[PDB]
Amino acid sequence: RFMQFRAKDSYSLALSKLEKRERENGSNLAFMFRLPFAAGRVFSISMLDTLLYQSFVKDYMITITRLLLGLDTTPGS
Amino acid sequence: AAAEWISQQRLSLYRRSERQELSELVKNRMKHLGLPTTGYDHQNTLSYVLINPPPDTRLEPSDIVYLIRSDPLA
Amino acid sequence: IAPVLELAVEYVKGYPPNSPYIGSSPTLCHLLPV
């Protein structure tokens, strides 16, 4: 939320209330509706924690993500 | 027709082993420094120590015997 | 829109020479001639 902070902004501070409702609804994607993250300006490397825990149930998740990032170049992919 | 050569190496580096990756890493550094790459050219052996074996144990090849040799100047 | 068928300085292209670490996936990249 602090990446591009406009303190004198009605809309950006209104998104804070929307984030509280998602936190109340038990949503792990609470930071979702922030303007910087949604635009791609900021990501947290804590997402790599989730990619590892998901691999317990989706063993393909690491390979799928790396193929998108190009970290592994399988011929024909 | 240069794409075939481009694709030829691509299918090779994909299947090249980790031993090759380790081997080329060293050779790249040696030719960077200037050492001859030839010479860098694994250990399928198992060794152990037998302190004071009985006088009946057979002596296999490649066995190193520890010795207490007397003092030459004595 | 065509329908989907049921059936089907100059830079050289090459792998980077010095991979900084083991396991670095070799990607075909644009490279300087020298």
Short mmCIF file of N, CA and C in Angstrom, two decimals:
data_model
loop_
_atom_site.label_atom_id
_atom_site.label_comp_id
_atom_site.label_asym_id
_atom_site.label_seq_id
_atom_site.Cartn_x
_atom_site.Cartn_y
_atom_site.Cartn_z
N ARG A 1 0.81 -1.21 0.00
CA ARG A 1 0.00 0.00 0.00
C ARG A 1 0.85 1.26 0.00
N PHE A 2 2.10 1.18 0.44
CA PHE A 2 2.95 2.34 0.62
C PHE A 2 3.80 2.67 -0.60
N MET A 3 3.67 1.91 -1.69
CA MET A 3 4.58 2.07 -2.83
C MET A 3 4.43 3.45 -3.47
N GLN A 4 3.20 3.82 -3.83
CA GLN A 4 2.90 5.12 -4.43
C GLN A 4 1.79 5.72 -3.59
N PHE A 5 2.17 6.37 -2.50
CA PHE A 5 1.23 6.80 -1.48
C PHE A 5 0.73 8.21 -1.80
N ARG A 6 -0.57 8.33 -2.02
CA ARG A 6 -1.24 9.61 -2.21
C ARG A 6 -2.13 9.83 -0.99
N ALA A 7 -1.62 10.57 -0.01
CA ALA A 7 -2.35 10.74 1.24
C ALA A 7 -3.59 11.60 1.04
N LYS A 8 -3.52 12.59 0.15
CA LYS A 8 -4.67 13.43 -0.16
C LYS A 8 -5.46 12.87 -1.34
N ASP A 9 -5.81 11.59 -1.25
CA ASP A 9 -6.54 10.90 -2.30
C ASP A 9 -7.73 10.18 -1.69
N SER A 10 -8.93 10.47 -2.19
CA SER A 10 -10.13 9.82 -1.66
C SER A 10 -10.24 8.38 -2.14
N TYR A 11 -9.91 8.13 -3.41
CA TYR A 11 -10.10 6.79 -3.97
C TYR A 11 -9.13 5.78 -3.37
N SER A 12 -7.85 6.15 -3.28
CA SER A 12 -6.84 5.20 -2.81
C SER A 12 -7.09 4.81 -1.36
N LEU A 13 -7.44 5.78 -0.51
CA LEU A 13 -7.76 5.47 0.88
C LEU A 13 -9.08 4.72 1.01
N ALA A 14 -9.97 4.86 0.02
CA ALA A 14 -11.20 4.07 0.03
C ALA A 14 -10.91 2.59 -0.18
N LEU A 15 -9.86 2.26 -0.93
CA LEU A 15 -9.48 0.87 -1.13
C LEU A 15 -9.03 0.21 0.17
N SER A 16 -8.61 1.00 1.16
CA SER A 16 -8.24 0.42 2.45
C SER A 16 -9.43 -0.24 3.12
N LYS A 17 -10.60 0.41 3.06
CA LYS A 17 -11.80 -0.19 3.64
C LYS A 17 -12.18 -1.47 2.91
N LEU A 18 -12.06 -1.48 1.58
CA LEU A 18 -12.35 -2.69 0.82
C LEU A 18 -11.40 -3.83 1.21
N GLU A 19 -10.14 -3.51 1.49
CA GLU A 19 -9.19 -4.52 1.93
C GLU A 19 -9.54 -5.07 3.30
N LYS A 20 -10.11 -4.24 4.18
CA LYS A 20 -10.53 -4.72 5.50
C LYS A 20 -11.63 -5.76 5.38
N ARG A 21 -12.58 -5.54 4.46
CA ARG A 21 -13.67 -6.50 4.28
C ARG A 21 -13.15 -7.85 3.82
N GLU A 22 -12.18 -7.86 2.90
CA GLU A 22 -11.59 -9.12 2.45
C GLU A 22 -10.85 -9.81 3.59
N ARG A 23 -10.15 -9.04 4.43
CA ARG A 23 -9.52 -9.61 5.61
C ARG A 23 -10.57 -10.19 6.56
N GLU A 24 -11.71 -9.52 6.69
CA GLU A 24 -12.79 -10.05 7.52
C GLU A 24 -13.38 -11.32 6.91
N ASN A 25 -13.46 -11.39 5.59
CA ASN A 25 -13.98 -12.55 4.89
C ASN A 25 -12.97 -13.69 4.77
N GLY A 26 -11.84 -13.60 5.47
CA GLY A 26 -10.84 -14.65 5.42
C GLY A 26 -10.16 -14.81 4.08
N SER A 27 -9.85 -13.71 3.41
CA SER A 27 -9.20 -13.75 2.11
C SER A 27 -7.70 -13.52 2.28
N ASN A 28 -6.90 -14.45 1.75
CA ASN A 28 -5.45 -14.28 1.78
C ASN A 28 -4.98 -13.26 0.75
N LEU A 29 -5.80 -12.96 -0.26
CA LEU A 29 -5.47 -11.96 -1.26
C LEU A 29 -6.09 -10.62 -0.87
N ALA A 30 -5.71 -10.15 0.32
CA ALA A 30 -6.19 -8.85 0.80
C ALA A 30 -5.49 -7.69 0.10
N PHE A 31 -4.18 -7.79 -0.10
CA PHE A 31 -3.40 -6.77 -0.80
C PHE A 31 -3.79 -6.65 -2.26
N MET A 32 -4.77 -7.44 -2.70
CA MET A 32 -5.08 -7.59 -4.12
C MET A 32 -5.49 -6.28 -4.77
N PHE A 33 -6.27 -5.46 -4.07
CA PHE A 33 -6.93 -4.32 -4.69
C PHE A 33 -6.13 -3.04 -4.62
N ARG A 34 -4.90 -3.09 -4.11
CA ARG A 34 -4.04 -1.91 -4.13
C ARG A 34 -3.64 -1.56 -5.56
N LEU A 35 -3.61 -0.25 -5.84
CA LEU A 35 -3.25 0.21 -7.18
C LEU A 35 -1.85 -0.21 -7.62
N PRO A 36 -0.80 -0.09 -6.80
CA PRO A 36 0.53 -0.49 -7.30
C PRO A 36 0.64 -1.97 -7.61
N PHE A 37 0.17 -2.85 -6.72
CA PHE A 37 0.28 -4.29 -6.96
C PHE A 37 -0.55 -4.71 -8.16
N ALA A 38 -1.76 -4.17 -8.29
CA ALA A 38 -2.62 -4.54 -9.41
C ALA A 38 -2.01 -4.11 -10.74
N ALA A 39 -1.30 -2.99 -10.75
CA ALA A 39 -0.63 -2.52 -11.96
C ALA A 39 0.71 -3.19 -12.20
N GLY A 40 1.18 -4.01 -11.26
CA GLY A 40 2.46 -4.67 -11.41
C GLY A 40 3.65 -3.90 -10.88
N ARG A 41 3.42 -2.78 -10.20
CA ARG A 41 4.53 -1.98 -9.70
C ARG A 41 5.28 -2.67 -8.57
N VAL A 42 4.59 -3.46 -7.74
CA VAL A 42 5.21 -4.12 -6.60
C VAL A 42 4.70 -5.55 -6.48
N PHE A 43 5.62 -6.45 -6.17
CA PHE A 43 5.28 -7.80 -5.74
C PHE A 43 6.18 -8.13 -4.56
N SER A 44 5.67 -8.98 -3.68
CA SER A 44 6.42 -9.47 -2.54
C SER A 44 6.94 -10.87 -2.84
N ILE A 45 8.15 -11.16 -2.37
CA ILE A 45 8.77 -12.45 -2.65
C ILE A 45 8.15 -13.49 -1.72
N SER A 46 7.24 -13.05 -0.85
CA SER A 46 6.46 -13.98 -0.05
C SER A 46 5.55 -14.84 -0.93
N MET A 47 5.30 -14.42 -2.17
CA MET A 47 4.58 -15.25 -3.12
C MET A 47 5.35 -16.53 -3.46
N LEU A 48 6.68 -16.52 -3.33
CA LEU A 48 7.45 -17.74 -3.56
C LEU A 48 7.27 -18.73 -2.42
N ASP A 49 6.92 -18.24 -1.23
CA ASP A 49 6.53 -19.14 -0.15
C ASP A 49 5.29 -19.93 -0.54
N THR A 50 4.28 -19.24 -1.09
CA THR A 50 3.04 -19.89 -1.47
C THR A 50 3.24 -20.86 -2.63
N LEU A 51 4.17 -20.55 -3.54
CA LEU A 51 4.45 -21.45 -4.65
C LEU A 51 5.05 -22.76 -4.17
N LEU A 52 5.76 -22.74 -3.03
CA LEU A 52 6.33 -23.96 -2.49
C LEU A 52 5.29 -24.78 -1.72
N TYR A 53 4.42 -24.11 -0.96
CA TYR A 53 3.39 -24.83 -0.22
C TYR A 53 2.35 -25.42 -1.17
N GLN A 54 2.05 -24.71 -2.26
CA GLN A 54 1.14 -25.25 -3.26
C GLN A 54 1.71 -26.50 -3.92
N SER A 55 3.04 -26.60 -4.00
CA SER A 55 3.66 -27.75 -4.64
C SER A 55 3.39 -29.05 -3.90
N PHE A 56 2.97 -28.97 -2.63
CA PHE A 56 2.54 -30.17 -1.92
C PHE A 56 1.29 -30.77 -2.56
N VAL A 57 0.41 -29.94 -3.11
CA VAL A 57 -0.79 -30.41 -3.76
C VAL A 57 -0.72 -30.30 -5.29
N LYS A 58 0.11 -29.40 -5.82
CA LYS A 58 0.30 -29.24 -7.26
C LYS A 58 1.80 -29.32 -7.53
N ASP A 59 2.30 -30.54 -7.77
CA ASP A 59 3.72 -30.76 -8.01
C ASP A 59 4.21 -30.12 -9.30
N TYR A 60 3.30 -29.70 -10.18
CA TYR A 60 3.65 -29.07 -11.44
C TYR A 60 3.80 -27.56 -11.33
N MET A 61 3.43 -26.97 -10.19
CA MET A 61 3.32 -25.52 -10.10
C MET A 61 4.68 -24.84 -10.31
N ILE A 62 5.73 -25.40 -9.71
CA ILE A 62 7.06 -24.81 -9.86
C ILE A 62 7.51 -24.87 -11.31
N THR A 63 7.34 -26.02 -11.96
CA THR A 63 7.75 -26.15 -13.35
C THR A 63 6.94 -25.23 -14.25
N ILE A 64 5.63 -25.12 -14.00
CA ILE A 64 4.78 -24.27 -14.82
C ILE A 64 5.21 -22.81 -14.72
N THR A 65 5.48 -22.35 -13.50
CA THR A 65 5.88 -20.95 -13.31
C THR A 65 7.22 -20.66 -13.96
N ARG A 66 8.19 -21.56 -13.80
CA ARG A 66 9.51 -21.35 -14.41
C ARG A 66 9.43 -21.32 -15.93
N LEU A 67 8.57 -22.16 -16.52
CA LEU A 67 8.41 -22.15 -17.97
C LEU A 67 7.85 -20.82 -18.45
N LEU A 68 6.96 -20.20 -17.67
CA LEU A 68 6.48 -18.87 -18.02
C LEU A 68 7.58 -17.83 -17.89
N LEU A 69 8.34 -17.87 -16.80
CA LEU A 69 9.44 -16.93 -16.60
C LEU A 69 10.64 -17.24 -17.48
N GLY A 70 10.69 -18.40 -18.12
CA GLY A 70 11.83 -18.79 -18.91
C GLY A 70 13.02 -19.28 -18.12
N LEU A 71 12.85 -19.52 -16.82
CA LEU A 71 13.96 -19.99 -16.00
C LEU A 71 14.41 -21.40 -16.38
N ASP A 72 13.55 -22.17 -17.04
CA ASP A 72 13.93 -23.44 -17.65
C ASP A 72 13.37 -23.49 -19.06
N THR A 73 14.23 -23.83 -20.02
CA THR A 73 13.88 -23.79 -21.44
C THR A 73 13.79 -25.23 -21.95
N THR A 74 12.61 -25.81 -21.82
CA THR A 74 12.36 -27.13 -22.40
C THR A 74 12.15 -26.98 -23.91
N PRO A 75 12.87 -27.74 -24.73
CA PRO A 75 12.65 -27.66 -26.18
C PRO A 75 11.21 -27.99 -26.55
N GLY A 76 10.65 -27.19 -27.45
CA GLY A 76 9.27 -27.35 -27.84
C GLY A 76 8.26 -26.70 -26.93
N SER A 77 8.70 -25.91 -25.95
CA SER A 77 7.82 -25.23 -25.01
C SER A 77 7.79 -23.74 -25.31
N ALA B 1 19.38 -22.18 -43.37
CA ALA B 1 19.67 -23.53 -42.90
C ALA B 1 20.46 -23.49 -41.60
N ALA B 2 20.79 -22.28 -41.14
CA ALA B 2 21.53 -22.13 -39.89
C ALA B 2 20.69 -22.48 -38.67
N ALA B 3 19.36 -22.51 -38.81
CA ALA B 3 18.50 -22.86 -37.68
C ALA B 3 18.70 -24.31 -37.26
N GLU B 4 19.00 -25.20 -38.21
CA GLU B 4 19.24 -26.60 -37.86
C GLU B 4 20.44 -26.74 -36.93
N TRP B 5 21.53 -26.02 -37.22
CA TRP B 5 22.67 -26.01 -36.31
C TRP B 5 22.30 -25.34 -34.99
N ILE B 6 21.48 -24.29 -35.05
CA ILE B 6 21.00 -23.64 -33.83
C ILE B 6 20.16 -24.62 -33.01
N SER B 7 19.28 -25.37 -33.68
CA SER B 7 18.47 -26.35 -32.98
C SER B 7 19.29 -27.58 -32.59
N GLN B 8 20.39 -27.85 -33.30
CA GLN B 8 21.22 -29.00 -32.97
C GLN B 8 21.85 -28.85 -31.59
N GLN B 9 22.46 -27.70 -31.32
CA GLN B 9 23.05 -27.47 -30.00
C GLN B 9 21.97 -27.36 -28.93
N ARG B 10 20.80 -26.81 -29.28
CA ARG B 10 19.74 -26.64 -28.29
C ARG B 10 19.31 -27.98 -27.71
N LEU B 11 19.15 -28.99 -28.57
CA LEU B 11 18.76 -30.31 -28.09
C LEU B 11 19.90 -31.01 -27.35
N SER B 12 21.14 -30.53 -27.51
CA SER B 12 22.27 -31.14 -26.82
C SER B 12 22.44 -30.55 -25.42
N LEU B 13 22.40 -29.22 -25.30
CA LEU B 13 22.54 -28.60 -23.99
C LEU B 13 21.37 -28.95 -23.08
N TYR B 14 20.20 -29.26 -23.66
CA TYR B 14 19.07 -29.69 -22.85
C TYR B 14 19.35 -31.04 -22.18
N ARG B 15 19.95 -31.98 -22.92
CA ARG B 15 20.20 -33.31 -22.39
C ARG B 15 21.57 -33.45 -21.73
N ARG B 16 22.41 -32.42 -21.75
CA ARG B 16 23.73 -32.55 -21.15
C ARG B 16 23.61 -32.68 -19.64
N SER B 17 24.43 -33.56 -19.07
CA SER B 17 24.29 -33.95 -17.67
C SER B 17 24.87 -32.87 -16.75
N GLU B 18 24.65 -33.06 -15.45
CA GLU B 18 25.25 -32.15 -14.47
C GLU B 18 26.75 -32.35 -14.37
N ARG B 19 27.23 -33.57 -14.63
CA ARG B 19 28.67 -33.81 -14.67
C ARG B 19 29.33 -33.00 -15.78
N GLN B 20 28.68 -32.93 -16.95
CA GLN B 20 29.19 -32.08 -18.02
C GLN B 20 29.17 -30.62 -17.61
N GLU B 21 28.08 -30.18 -16.96
CA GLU B 21 27.99 -28.79 -16.52
C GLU B 21 29.10 -28.46 -15.54
N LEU B 22 29.39 -29.37 -14.61
CA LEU B 22 30.50 -29.17 -13.69
C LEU B 22 31.84 -29.22 -14.43
N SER B 23 31.97 -30.12 -15.40
CA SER B 23 33.23 -30.27 -16.12
C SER B 23 33.53 -29.04 -16.98
N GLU B 24 32.54 -28.54 -17.71
CA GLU B 24 32.77 -27.35 -18.53
C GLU B 24 33.02 -26.11 -17.68
N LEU B 25 32.43 -26.05 -16.48
CA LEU B 25 32.67 -24.91 -15.61
C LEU B 25 34.15 -24.81 -15.24
N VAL B 26 34.77 -25.93 -14.90
CA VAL B 26 36.19 -25.92 -14.57
C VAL B 26 37.02 -25.56 -15.80
N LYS B 27 36.76 -26.24 -16.92
CA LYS B 27 37.57 -26.02 -18.12
C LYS B 27 37.44 -24.59 -18.63
N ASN B 28 36.27 -23.97 -18.45
CA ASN B 28 36.12 -22.57 -18.81
C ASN B 28 37.03 -21.68 -17.96
N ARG B 29 37.19 -22.02 -16.68
CA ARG B 29 38.06 -21.25 -15.81
C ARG B 29 39.53 -21.50 -16.13
N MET B 30 39.88 -22.75 -16.46
CA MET B 30 41.28 -23.06 -16.75
C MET B 30 41.76 -22.34 -18.00
N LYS B 31 40.97 -22.37 -19.08
CA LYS B 31 41.34 -21.63 -20.28
C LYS B 31 41.22 -20.13 -20.09
N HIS B 32 40.46 -19.68 -19.09
CA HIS B 32 40.48 -18.27 -18.72
C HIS B 32 41.82 -17.91 -18.08
N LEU B 33 42.30 -18.74 -17.15
CA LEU B 33 43.60 -18.51 -16.54
C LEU B 33 44.74 -18.82 -17.50
N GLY B 34 44.60 -19.88 -18.29
CA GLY B 34 45.62 -20.27 -19.25
C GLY B 34 46.12 -21.69 -19.09
N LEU B 35 45.61 -22.47 -18.13
CA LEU B 35 46.07 -23.83 -17.95
C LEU B 35 45.58 -24.72 -19.10
N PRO B 36 46.33 -25.77 -19.43
CA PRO B 36 45.89 -26.68 -20.50
C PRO B 36 44.69 -27.50 -20.04
N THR B 37 43.62 -27.47 -20.85
CA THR B 37 42.41 -28.20 -20.49
C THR B 37 42.68 -29.69 -20.36
N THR B 38 43.46 -30.25 -21.28
CA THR B 38 43.90 -31.63 -21.14
C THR B 38 44.72 -31.78 -19.86
N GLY B 39 44.41 -32.81 -19.08
CA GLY B 39 44.94 -33.00 -17.74
C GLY B 39 43.87 -33.03 -16.67
N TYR B 40 42.78 -32.29 -16.89
CA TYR B 40 41.61 -32.40 -16.02
C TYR B 40 40.99 -33.80 -16.07
N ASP B 41 41.22 -34.54 -17.15
CA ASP B 41 40.71 -35.90 -17.28
C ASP B 41 41.30 -36.83 -16.22
N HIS B 42 33.46 -41.14 -10.20
CA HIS B 42 34.86 -41.33 -10.55
C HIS B 42 35.57 -42.23 -9.55
N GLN B 43 35.24 -42.06 -8.27
CA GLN B 43 35.85 -42.83 -7.19
C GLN B 43 34.88 -43.93 -6.78
N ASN B 44 34.95 -45.05 -7.49
CA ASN B 44 34.13 -46.22 -7.17
C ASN B 44 34.89 -47.16 -6.23
N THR B 45 35.24 -46.62 -5.06
CA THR B 45 36.03 -47.35 -4.08
C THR B 45 35.43 -47.16 -2.69
N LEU B 46 35.68 -48.14 -1.82
CA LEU B 46 35.24 -48.09 -0.43
C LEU B 46 36.40 -48.57 0.43
N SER B 47 36.80 -47.75 1.40
CA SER B 47 37.98 -48.02 2.21
C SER B 47 37.65 -47.96 3.69
N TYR B 48 38.45 -48.68 4.48
CA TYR B 48 38.28 -48.73 5.93
C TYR B 48 39.59 -49.18 6.56
N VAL B 49 39.67 -49.02 7.89
CA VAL B 49 40.87 -49.29 8.66
C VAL B 49 40.65 -50.53 9.52
N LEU B 50 41.63 -51.43 9.53
CA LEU B 50 41.53 -52.68 10.28
C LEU B 50 42.65 -52.72 11.32
N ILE B 51 42.38 -52.19 12.51
CA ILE B 51 43.40 -52.13 13.55
C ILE B 51 43.64 -53.52 14.11
N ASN B 52 44.88 -53.99 14.00
CA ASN B 52 45.31 -55.28 14.53
C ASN B 52 44.39 -56.43 14.11
N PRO B 53 44.36 -56.77 12.83
CA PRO B 53 43.58 -57.93 12.39
C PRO B 53 44.23 -59.22 12.84
N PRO B 54 43.47 -60.30 12.96
CA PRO B 54 44.05 -61.60 13.31
C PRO B 54 45.07 -62.04 12.27
N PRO B 55 45.96 -62.97 12.62
CA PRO B 55 47.01 -63.37 11.67
C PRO B 55 46.49 -64.24 10.53
N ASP B 56 45.17 -64.42 10.45
CA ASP B 56 44.57 -65.27 9.43
C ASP B 56 43.83 -64.52 8.33
N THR B 57 43.69 -63.20 8.44
CA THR B 57 42.97 -62.45 7.41
C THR B 57 43.77 -62.41 6.12
N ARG B 58 43.10 -62.70 5.01
CA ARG B 58 43.76 -62.70 3.71
C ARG B 58 44.16 -61.28 3.31
N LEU B 59 45.23 -61.18 2.52
CA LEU B 59 45.76 -59.90 2.09
C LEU B 59 45.31 -59.62 0.67
N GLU B 60 44.26 -58.80 0.53
CA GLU B 60 43.80 -58.39 -0.78
C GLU B 60 44.78 -57.40 -1.41
N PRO B 61 44.74 -57.25 -2.73
CA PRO B 61 45.56 -56.22 -3.38
C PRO B 61 45.08 -54.82 -3.00
N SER B 62 45.96 -53.85 -3.24
CA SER B 62 45.72 -52.44 -2.93
C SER B 62 45.50 -52.20 -1.44
N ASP B 63 46.06 -53.06 -0.59
CA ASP B 63 45.97 -52.89 0.85
C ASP B 63 47.21 -52.18 1.36
N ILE B 64 47.00 -51.11 2.13
CA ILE B 64 48.09 -50.33 2.72
C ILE B 64 48.22 -50.75 4.17
N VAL B 65 49.41 -51.20 4.55
CA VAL B 65 49.68 -51.68 5.90
C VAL B 65 50.39 -50.58 6.69
N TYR B 66 49.84 -50.25 7.86
CA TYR B 66 50.51 -49.32 8.75
C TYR B 66 51.65 -50.02 9.46
N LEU B 67 52.80 -49.34 9.54
CA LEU B 67 54.01 -49.95 10.08
C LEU B 67 54.64 -49.03 11.11
N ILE B 68 55.16 -49.64 12.18
CA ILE B 68 56.02 -48.93 13.11
C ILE B 68 57.45 -49.37 12.83
N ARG B 69 58.14 -48.65 11.96
CA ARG B 69 59.49 -49.01 11.59
C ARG B 69 60.48 -48.46 12.61
N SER B 70 61.47 -49.27 12.95
CA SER B 70 62.44 -48.89 13.97
C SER B 70 63.24 -47.67 13.53
N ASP B 71 63.78 -46.95 14.51
CA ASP B 71 64.50 -45.72 14.25
C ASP B 71 65.76 -46.01 13.45
N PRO B 72 65.96 -45.36 12.30
CA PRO B 72 67.17 -45.64 11.50
C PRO B 72 68.46 -45.34 12.22
N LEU B 73 68.49 -44.33 13.08
CA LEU B 73 69.70 -43.93 13.78
C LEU B 73 69.91 -44.69 15.09
N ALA B 74 69.10 -45.71 15.35
CA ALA B 74 69.25 -46.51 16.56
C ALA B 74 70.20 -47.68 16.34
N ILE C 1 -12.98 -13.26 -39.32
CA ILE C 1 -11.88 -13.99 -38.70
C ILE C 1 -11.83 -15.41 -39.26
N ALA C 2 -10.63 -15.84 -39.64
CA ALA C 2 -10.46 -17.17 -40.20
C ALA C 2 -10.77 -18.22 -39.14
N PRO C 3 -11.36 -19.36 -39.52
CA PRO C 3 -11.70 -20.38 -38.53
C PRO C 3 -10.48 -21.18 -38.09
N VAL C 4 -10.63 -21.82 -36.94
CA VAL C 4 -9.53 -22.58 -36.34
C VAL C 4 -9.50 -23.97 -36.96
N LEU C 5 -8.35 -24.33 -37.52
CA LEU C 5 -8.21 -25.60 -38.22
C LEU C 5 -8.11 -26.75 -37.23
N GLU C 6 -8.71 -27.89 -37.60
CA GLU C 6 -8.61 -29.09 -36.78
C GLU C 6 -7.20 -29.66 -36.76
N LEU C 7 -6.40 -29.38 -37.78
CA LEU C 7 -5.02 -29.85 -37.86
C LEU C 7 -4.15 -28.71 -38.36
N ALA C 8 -2.86 -28.78 -38.04
CA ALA C 8 -1.91 -27.77 -38.49
C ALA C 8 -1.63 -27.92 -39.98
N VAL C 9 25.63 -2.30 -35.61
CA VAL C 9 26.22 -3.58 -35.25
C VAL C 9 25.17 -4.69 -35.31
N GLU C 10 25.53 -5.81 -35.92
CA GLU C 10 24.62 -6.94 -36.07
C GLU C 10 24.90 -7.97 -34.98
N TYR C 11 23.86 -8.34 -34.24
CA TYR C 11 23.99 -9.28 -33.14
C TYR C 11 23.76 -10.70 -33.61
N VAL C 12 24.65 -11.60 -33.21
CA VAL C 12 24.51 -13.01 -33.51
C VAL C 12 23.63 -13.66 -32.45
N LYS C 13 23.09 -14.83 -32.77
CA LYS C 13 22.26 -15.60 -31.85
C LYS C 13 23.04 -16.82 -31.39
N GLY C 14 23.25 -16.92 -30.08
CA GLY C 14 23.97 -18.05 -29.52
C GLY C 14 23.84 -18.05 -28.01
N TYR C 15 24.24 -19.17 -27.42
CA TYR C 15 24.19 -19.30 -25.97
C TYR C 15 25.33 -18.50 -25.34
N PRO C 16 25.09 -17.88 -24.19
CA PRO C 16 26.15 -17.14 -23.50
C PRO C 16 27.30 -18.07 -23.14
N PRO C 17 28.54 -17.62 -23.31
CA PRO C 17 29.70 -18.50 -23.09
C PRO C 17 29.86 -18.94 -21.64
N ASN C 18 29.87 -17.98 -20.71
CA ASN C 18 30.18 -18.25 -19.31
C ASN C 18 28.89 -18.25 -18.50
N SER C 19 28.41 -19.44 -18.16
CA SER C 19 27.30 -19.56 -17.23
C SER C 19 27.80 -19.30 -15.81
N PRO C 20 27.26 -18.31 -15.09
CA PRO C 20 27.83 -17.97 -13.78
C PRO C 20 27.70 -19.07 -12.74
N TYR C 21 26.78 -20.01 -12.90
CA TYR C 21 26.58 -21.04 -11.88
C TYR C 21 26.05 -22.31 -12.53
N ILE C 22 26.18 -23.41 -11.81
CA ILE C 22 25.69 -24.70 -12.27
C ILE C 22 24.17 -24.72 -12.16
N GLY C 23 23.52 -25.29 -13.17
CA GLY C 23 22.07 -25.31 -13.23
C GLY C 23 21.46 -24.13 -13.95
N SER C 24 22.26 -23.16 -14.38
CA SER C 24 21.76 -22.03 -15.15
C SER C 24 21.26 -22.54 -16.50
N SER C 25 19.95 -22.48 -16.70
CA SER C 25 19.35 -23.03 -17.91
C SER C 25 19.85 -22.27 -19.13
N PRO C 26 20.45 -22.94 -20.11
CA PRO C 26 20.96 -22.23 -21.29
C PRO C 26 19.84 -21.74 -22.19
N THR C 27 19.71 -20.42 -22.29
CA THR C 27 18.72 -19.79 -23.16
C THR C 27 19.43 -19.13 -24.33
N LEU C 28 18.89 -19.34 -25.53
CA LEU C 28 19.45 -18.70 -26.72
C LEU C 28 19.20 -17.20 -26.66
N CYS C 29 20.27 -16.43 -26.58
CA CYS C 29 20.18 -14.99 -26.39
C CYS C 29 20.91 -14.24 -27.49
N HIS C 30 20.49 -13.00 -27.70
CA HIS C 30 21.24 -12.10 -28.57
C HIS C 30 22.61 -11.83 -27.94
N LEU C 31 23.66 -11.90 -28.75
CA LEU C 31 25.02 -11.76 -28.26
C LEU C 31 25.81 -10.83 -29.17
N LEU C 32 26.77 -10.14 -28.57
CA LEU C 32 27.70 -9.33 -29.35
C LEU C 32 28.62 -10.25 -30.15
N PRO C 33 29.00 -9.85 -31.37
CA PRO C 33 29.94 -10.68 -32.15
C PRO C 33 31.27 -10.88 -31.45
N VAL C 34 31.74 -9.88 -30.71
CA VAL C 34 33.01 -9.96 -29.99
C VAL C 34 32.74 -9.60 -28.53
#
